Amino acid sequence: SRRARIERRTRESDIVIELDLDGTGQVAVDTGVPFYDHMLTALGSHASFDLTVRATGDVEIEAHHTIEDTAIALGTALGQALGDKRGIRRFGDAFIPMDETLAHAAVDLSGRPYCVHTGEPDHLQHTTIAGSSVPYHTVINRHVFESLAANARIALHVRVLYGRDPHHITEAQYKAVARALRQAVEPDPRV
């Protein structure tokens, strides 16, 4: 049984995560930042996790605090669910083509906490993805991966080999992390 429930209450936000590593992509995310919900839903489904996330935070300011607190809580949940990490593949990686974009992630689940994020086009440091609700500033992508890695205590390397559309670039990175985690957490039939 590789399950965790994390509750995180801060001045800024209130988070509940229910995570099962050995799921079928049963995923429900509600953070009040709908593009983020879309990215964490993609992450949960492509990782074949069962994942519920419920977060409420200070989105009057902007999404940053809620996004960061959610990624910290989600990282904590991944680390707790992995437990002793005995008998798992440990290493995982995935390429994700998305139209013009190619992204990649590699993970070491028994590595010390580390995040390297490279290749993201410079326009993603000031791009906003905006709809009818709270917008998502793509500059936070790096912060999400750093927060996940630091709190799950894993080595996570995210690369954008190339791309143009900020939605494609962002979504391909979340999916790549997801498929890299899925491979790494898998039981290893020889180890």
List residues binding Mn ion (CB under 5 A): 68, 171
CB of 88 vs a copy of itself, minimal distance in Å: 14
Residue 143 in contact with a copy of itself, rule: CB under 8 A: yes
Q: Does residue 110 touch a copy of itself according to CB under 8 A?
A: no
Question: Element (H or E) spanning 111, and its range?
Answer: none
**Closer CB to Mn ion, 50 or 171, in the complex:** 171
Binding flags for a copy of itself, 31-50, as an x/- string (CB under 8 A) = ---xx-xx---------x--
Nearest to 71 by CA among 10, 136, 133, 151: 151
Q: How far is the CB of 5 from a copy of itself (least distance, A)?
A: 22
| Residue 157: strand, helix, or coil | strand
Min dist. Cβ of residue 142 to a copy of itself (A): 7
Mind giving me the DSSP string for 83-103? TT-TTB--EEEEEEEETTEEE
The CB-side HSE value for 48 (13 A sphere, CA atoms) comes to 11
Least Å from the CB of residue 171 to Mn ion = 5
Count of residues of this chain found to bind a copy of itself when the rule CB under 8 A is applied: 68
**From edge to edge, which strands make up the β-sheet containing 101-108?**
91-98, 101-108, 155-162, 114-118
Nearer to Mn ion by Cβ, of 19 and 72: the residue is 72
DSSP string covering 19-37, please?
EESS--S-EEEE-S-HHHH
CA 177 to each of CA 11, 13, 20, 96, 135: distance values in angstroms, whole numbers, following the listed order: 29, 25, 17, 9, 22
C-alpha–C-alpha distance, residues 141 and 147, integer Å:
10
Residue 174 in the binding site for a copy of itself (CB under 8 A): no
What is the binding site for a copy of itself (CB under 8 A)? 24-25, 34-35, 37-38, 48, 58-64, 72, 91, 93-100, 102, 106-108, 111-114, 116, 118, 123, 125-135, 137, 139-140, 142-143, 146-147, 150, 155-157, 159, 161-162, 164-167, 179, 182, 190-191
